[PDB]
Each structure stands twice: as C-alpha cells, then as structure tokens.
Amino acid sequence: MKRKGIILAGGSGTRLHPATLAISKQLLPVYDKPMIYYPLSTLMLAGIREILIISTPQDTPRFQQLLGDGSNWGLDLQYAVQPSPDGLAQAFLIGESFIGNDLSALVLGDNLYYGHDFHELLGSASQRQTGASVFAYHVLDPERYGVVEFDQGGKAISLEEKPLEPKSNYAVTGLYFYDQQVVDIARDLKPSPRGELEITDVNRAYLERGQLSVEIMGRGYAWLDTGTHDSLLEAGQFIATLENRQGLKVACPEEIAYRQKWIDAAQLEKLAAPLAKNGYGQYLKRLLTETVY
Amino acid sequence: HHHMKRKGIILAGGSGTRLHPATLAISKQLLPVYDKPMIYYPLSTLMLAGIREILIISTPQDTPRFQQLLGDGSNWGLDLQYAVQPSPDGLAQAFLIGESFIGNDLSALVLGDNLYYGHDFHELLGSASQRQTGASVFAYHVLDPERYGVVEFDQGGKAISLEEKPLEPKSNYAVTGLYFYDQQVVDIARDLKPSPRGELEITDVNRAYLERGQLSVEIMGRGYAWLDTGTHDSLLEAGQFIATLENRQGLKVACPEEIAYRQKWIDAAQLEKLAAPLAKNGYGQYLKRLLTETVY
Amino acid sequence: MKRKGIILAGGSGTRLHPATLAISKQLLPVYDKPMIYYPLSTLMLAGIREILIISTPQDTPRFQQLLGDGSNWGLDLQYAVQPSPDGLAQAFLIGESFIGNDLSALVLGDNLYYGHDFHELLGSASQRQTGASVFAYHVLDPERYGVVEFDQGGKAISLEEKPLEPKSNYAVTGLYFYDQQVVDIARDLKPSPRGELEITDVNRAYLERGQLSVEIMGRGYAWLDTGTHDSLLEAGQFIATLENRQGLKVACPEEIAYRQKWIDAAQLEKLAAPLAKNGYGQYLKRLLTETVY
C-alpha cells in the first residue's frame, strides 16, 4: 500500500513575535534553506511523494510560491489551511479527503532530524501497514512535550501531554506514521482543557488498543529544537558545522529526489541552472558527476 | 521667491538570487537576527540619529509585509512611508525613487541589512547629523575590503580617493552602509550613468562629494561592531553576537519601542499599550520592565 | 584475541600558538571535558580497556595526573612519550613493547566522533582479526588528509597523503585498527619528504597486500575538526547543542565504563562524589537511577 504525507506548518501564535510577526516560522531559513525543506526532506527520505502542506490562511500562497506542485522534484504537492491553531490532530480533519483510504504520516513543519541510517529508521516505520509508529527521544525538558512512560521491560505503558511531573525523560518526536484508523480516531476527539485537538490523544487511542509502536530514537540522532530564538540559532549553527565539514548538505530536496531516482540527471541539471552563481546551484551541479556513498 | 531636519531612507529591496533558496519566500530584511527582524536594526539606527520621517524602499512583492510589521510609525512616534523598487538598479536609485519624499530636506541612507553596535554610537551619529553641508560617511577596518567601497587616506589622515570593490584595495577601510547627505544628493544621483554592472553606484555619489571637498569621512573605531549579513555564515554570526550581548546584559540591541521611549517620542502610557499584546513573551515582558527600571 | 589501544596525543607544533603555547591541545576542553576524553571514550566504546597514551615529554605528567592508571574507570592505562613530532606511525615504534603480540587500534588524540550505532561500527572493525580497518569520510577539504580513491565498483585502489590534486573527497579518519603486522610494517618505514613516518604508508602497505578494509563512515556521522581555532569552537558548540537538547553527555568515560559493565553502580557512586556540586557529578549520580536506551 501507498503512504501519503502531511506537513503541519501552522501558526506558533505570538510566541516568537516580533521575529515571526511578518511571516510564519517554517518559511524562515535554518542556515542555507527554508525550514520546511527539512521536514519535507524527511518525508521524502521515508519514500513519500504525495504530500499535503497545511499552513495559516495568510501563508499558503507563500508555501505554494516556494514549493509549487512538486513536479520539478518528482513530488505531488497539494495545499490546505488551518484557520486557527486548534491542535496538531486537526491535520487529520483538514487532511481527511487528501488521505482518502491510504496510509499516512504526519511531520511537524519546524522539526529537524539528522543521523546515520535515518533512511532505514523511517523505512522500518513506513513498512508497518497496521497500527501507528512514533519515536521517543531523550530530552532535558520533557514537560514541553508528549511524554512516554516505559515499564521495566521497556514497554510503553502511558502517554501524557505536557505533564507537570513527567514520568521519564522520553519525548514523542514530531514524526508520526498511521494506518487507516487515524482519521476516524481524530474525528471522535474532543477538545482538551487547552482547547486543542491533541495528537497525544490520537496516539493514546492506538496505545489502549496495543497498536502503538514506540521506537527509541537513539542518542546518536539529533532531533533539533526550533521552539525558541536560542534553539533556532543552535540549529543553524549545527547544520552549518555539518555542511562546512563535509561539503555535503543536510535536507537538500533536489539531492534526495535524485538519489531516490524520482528525477534523472537531466532534470537535476536544469534545477542547477537558476542558482548556478551561488553555492546551492554549485552543489547541485557537483552532484551530477560525484559519487557519494 | 523662497523663504534643518533630516529624513531617512532604508533600502530593503531585492538582494537578488544570491541567498536563494533561504530567501525565496521572503526578503532578507525580514529574516530575523536573533529575536527581531533584521529591518529593526537599521530602523533603530535612524531613530538613534534622531530621524523620525523615514522611507522604506522594498520590492513590490514584500511591501505589504514590511507595512504589516511596521505600520505608519505612529505607535513608535515616527512617520513611515513606503516606496517600491521594481528592479534592483543600485543603491543610488534610493534618491530617484525617494525624490518627492526628500523634498528640500537633508537626508540619511542606511542599508536595511546592516547592523551596528557600540558605545557612544548616539554621539557618533549625532556629529554626522549636525553637519548640515556636504556628505558624511564612516570608514571601518575590515578583513575583506575588496567587497566594499574602500577609502584611501594620506599621511595626515585626509581621505584622498574612493574605489568600489577594488581587486587591490589601498587600505582595509570600508565605507559602512550608513550615509548622511545635504540637499545636493538628489541632483548628483540624477546625473549618474549606470556602471559596467548595470547599477547606479553610491560610491560614484560619495566621490562627487569628495571631488567638491565636501565629503567628511569619519573613522568608526575598532571598538564598534559593524556586522556582516552578506552570507549565510555571517548571518548566523550576527544572531549569535546579538544573543550574547542580550543574554549577558538583560538589555536589547535595536529595540525600537525602547529607543522611541528614550528619545521621548512616546511616553510611559504609550509604551504600556505597546507591551500588552506581547505580555506573554520575552519581548513584551522587556517593554514592561523598561517602565519601572532606570537604565543608564 | 585481545585488542590494545593507543591514543596519540603529541605535539601540533606552533600551529595554534599562542593558545597552545602553555599546554598541549589534547588537554584543553571541548565544551565540558578535556579533549582527550573523546578519543579515550572512542576506544572504550570499541571495548578496549588496555590503553597507551603517548604525549610530549612536557605533557605526560599532566595526562598522568588527569587520567591515573585507569583503575577507577575499569581501564588499564600506561604512558609513553614522543620526543619530537616525526609522524603518526611512530606510535607503533614507541608502542611496540606495549602492543607485544596483540591486536591494536590507534586513535588520534584530537579527533571527535558522534553518531548512531557508533558502537557497532567500531565493533565490526574490532572483530576483524586479520588485516587493517580504516574509515573514509566525505569532507570539503581532502588535501588536508589521507585521501582514498575508489573504483567504479567502490573498491579502494589508492591512498595519497595530502595530495596537491586529491582523487576523491574521501579522507581517512583518525581511527585505525591493525593486526599483528603493524609494528613490523612501521619498523621498515623510511621517513617521508616531510621527514615523517607516515601512517598513510602503513595503510598503503596493507592495501598492496589487499589487506586494507576501507569502510565508509556515512554522512550521518559527525567527525569533527579540531585543526584550527575556528573548528575547535565549532566542536564545542556542536557538543553543547547535543548535550543541552538531550540532557545526555557525549564521550563521558565514567558513563561508558558503567554501561560496558566495567564498573558497578557502587563505583560510579564514588566517582560521582567529588564533583557532586557541579553538573558533571550531578550527571553521574542521575545515571545510577535512570534507564537510558
């Protein structure tokens, strides 16, 4: 079966104002590319080509202008809007008809991932055709997130959203795979005390049915924080260090498409043309002739 | 028969494709430098020079976004007006585009991607602003002067030549992106012919003032930071730099609300209203603290 | 068979003076711990407990004071000196009697590694009981290093040290595993045009015999640069971002020992005592009661 993707790139309220007064966070750069390139690249690494992008009513034209219909990158992009920030699960209501009868995967528009064999970690989540797969990652501040509690045997036994007193230091990352059950689970959700349709309520629905796979995302992966000005800066510094050391880019969608064999050498060459005078075009050109393992 | 204050221009137009793809969805001057939009810094810089009437020049695509962020200036005791530069034809064009805005007044041009920091910056700007005749620029020692307008000095310290992006610079002293002009500038600008790059050059403007003995070049000392936003790397260094100062001090660099409050262009009651819609984030809480604390 | 380790923490000349005028680079911190903790931790992750540390004649007391005989961390540390910086291969001459008849592994004292499943990448190199295993990593500046050339089939066909015109962008990292042949290969080496006993000559010796395994260290690993002031700063910023995000440390030797089960809970507790008032002791204490996957 096929899996479809959703990037939720909606409003972060006034939290980062005035930096985000003018445009939504996910259109701002992390180092050399718009933030949304990173979760888009994530979906593409998981082998997902049909992708729905959800943003504020103000910002859809801007994502649409940036990304197009995706055909240039061998993707099929569609767009939809979240009128108000009423919770992550709302992605599945807005995205209901896009999903139709397929498998799905939700990625948060402001989450960055890096690590060895990230392709396979996604692939093993993508392969599971029933139930939901999520990731748990050790963090210093688990109160900010969906917290997963494990028993002595390592089995996930509870989930709590932003608990006052967290049960472990393991947080559910912003990457979620679901089967055909998600839409129907989402539609039955009731708004939380914070007025939000909670993604953690969707994930707890699968947990009660014993259908939630919680895979550990090991300490050798970087799940980067874009929630504060400070953490945003750290993410830019982290990506810059990696790219300048290696002469290789992180989350370059044109490169990912090309390695997935969704575009051929001749298309990459055309994509390399408009940016030819800067480092990004120079990078895409160099990928035509170099072997990178 | 006919019978002086200074107006400001911020040029925040198209930085071309140079920083694509990071700048595909928005112009550079709306990207943040740490906790605030880049345009806040040159705006705060004009304000520090005592300038309240300011023209913002941007692309047709991005003007509404600048307008949404900044308004007409009334919240901050300013008057902000808007003009478009449909085609990126060079910095000097600001004066053709801003001709009617300028009228018969003195003026100041600042690049919308330029950040400054340092002690007695107010007084440095004040002395350039008080000089009512001729032009005033600032020379700053940089590693890579080939990237800029470069000023050559003689033994006595007098500026004797200006060159734009010379391959072999005569000194390491670059002209910063901040410029003060008398009433002659618009006319100088109209008589310019495009360079062999298809651009109306600010260096040709400054040379004109120099050839007439009316260019003052003041040194901006090594104790000031004139920060680079020309690359992705330098942009990142710029944010790290502001963050270090702000987290150290508990004070902000280029907070426009604060600067208007200190110039006495808005009062305590007005600052309070400015603080309210941001009361739950660090920026609003900072505006509120300014109401009770004495900061020397 | 057993494998023994050598950390070469010798002189970097005047290259970083005056920052390194007072003490050798490998005794300076990267973020929260002395640099040498990182390659030491690397050896320990590869399961190596008997370790020789080589430094300048001036700096051995300082390493000796810092690290002791290792018994507190379940290691067996010995020390030796490199009188002059006459090449990396000299590690095997100085280290000849330490190595005796065993397998060995050399790590450079100023190299930092991070990534998912780094333990297994080392383990698979450590398992090979014959020949030499090295790693190749894509870098922007291959002229600075030992450059490995691959044929269309991906087989390593040449090695050149600091070539004027490098054949690929793949550099041999500062981590090397050898069998019993290394000492004898090293002893027959002749000084290069730069007056150095070249590690690349040792590795080319195994290559000619077809006994050099060149494993790719993928782009999902970070091999960090400590060669310049700028790169040293980047390494500190990179480690700080990882540790503050996760609440977990990179290359904490006490933790690594404890997870390898070379020290028990009661010993970790004693190690946590002197530093109790700072974050490092607080970290070691917290490791007594928390489950970390």
Place this chain on the structure above:
Amino acid sequence: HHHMKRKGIILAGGSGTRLHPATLAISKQLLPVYDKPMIYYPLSTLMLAGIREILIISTPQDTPRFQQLLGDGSNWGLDLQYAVQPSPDGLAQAFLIGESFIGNDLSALVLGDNLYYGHDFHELLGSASQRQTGASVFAYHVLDPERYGVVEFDQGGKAISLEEKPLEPKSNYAVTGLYFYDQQVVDIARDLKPSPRGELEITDVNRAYLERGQLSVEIMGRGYAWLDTGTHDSLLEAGQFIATLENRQGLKVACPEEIAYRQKWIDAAQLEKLAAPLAKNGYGQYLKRLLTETVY
C-alpha cells in the same frame, strides 16, 4: 622622614572544582578564548590602562606555566612578577599576597578570567587611573546581578549601597572585575575578617571606600561588552564573540604585542623579532602586518 604610577595585579588562581573536569589538567586562565590564552585579555586590559608593572597570582601548581607563556615581560616592554596563592581564600587576599609588590604605590586589580571590549575603553580606563585618591570601580547592567557585587543608586545617580550576591538585587548593576585603588587598600585588606563562606571579600573592601566617601562608581555603558566566563556555556559564547569581531575586522582583541607597540613600549625592530617564531601561523603574520599598516 619620607620625601604617581600604578602597579597591577591579575588574580588567576584556583577556580576550585567548579569547572571540573575541563579544568582538571590546567587552570582556567590558560584556557583559550578563541585564538589566545584567557590571561591575555586581562593582561591587555592592564596594559591599556598604562600599567607596566604587574603581579600575576596563580596556584603553586600552575605558576611555571604562566611563567613559560609570559616570561618576565621584557619582550613586551613590561615587568612581570609572580606570587602564589596556595589556598583560594578570596579576591581581597591579592593585597596581602601582593603587599611587598605594591609598596607605597597605587594599584589595580583585575580578574584573570574577565574580558572587556568597546570603544574608547582606553579613555574609560584612563579616567579611572588618573583619580589618585580613593577607589574606582565599574557598574555594568547584567541579567543576573545575584551572581555579583551589586550597586544601588539613589535618584541623583549616587552609589548608596553595595551588596555581595544578594538574593533580591537592588538594581541590575554589577561591579565588573576591574578595580583601581590608592595606598589605603592594603590596610583595609589586612583588617578584613573572613565572610560566612570562608573568604576575604572585595565587596567589603569597596564598601570601606564607600563608607569613607571615596568610592567612585562609573557606569560601563551597554555599548561595552563585559563577557562572562563563569560557565562552559558562557566560555563558548566568549570565544564565538571574539572570533566574530576578529574575522570581521582583520584586527585582534587583546593582542599584547600590538598594545605594547601602540603604547610605544616596544619599537618596530622589537615587534619584528616577536613576529619571527610565529611567522607561519596567523598570529605571527598579524604581528608583521602591524609594522606597515596604519590602523586608526
């Protein structure tokens, strides 16, 4: 019957176990801040104040390493002497340990882990150094004044109290780690009794001057950077900050060779000799460039 220049002290002793294990093998003041040892910055700071006779106070373990780095000062036109602090008994102890070094002279105490940057810093130091009677300190607005000596001001700006690490600070104005004293300091220091932390407090010393009407507290403006080296995080921010300024400018912060050359304590011939053993790295190449270039 008996019948004024100023001596300097740098305290670069034990920072305890606080930054262990990073500081297990060497003391903090020899860790680099970017391209140079931390001790270079306070050393350059004393030099900028015109002080040439300087006592370095370190642990018995690390004195030889300070001596190996710095020598007797003769290469840089200074005279450097050494003393040990066997036990970390508090900052004021510098004056008991440095009593014979000081003699009948004025003095200046600087913390060996403190970095300063900004425009007309020379003149700010000059005005503190010229005041021959009483003591001089600097107050700087910080986010976390609870960590420092905190000065309270009245409506007219007069300093009226000093508190060491108060839980509820009276202002955000911290006393920086740079202190100028007349001849009374040693005696004040000898009469101090240890605090309820087992330490001889510089704040008790400064309070003594204040209780006598002889403490001048000058504001160090927000346009100066007074950088934090108290944590691993702030140390990293410190190096990022120097690197940004130096890579921007093609000039160094706190290069002692340069500062002595500019004070005229060494001449061109001497600077050249200093440049030679480092001719192949960036630091030596920088010393050589200083011989031919005019830097304003």
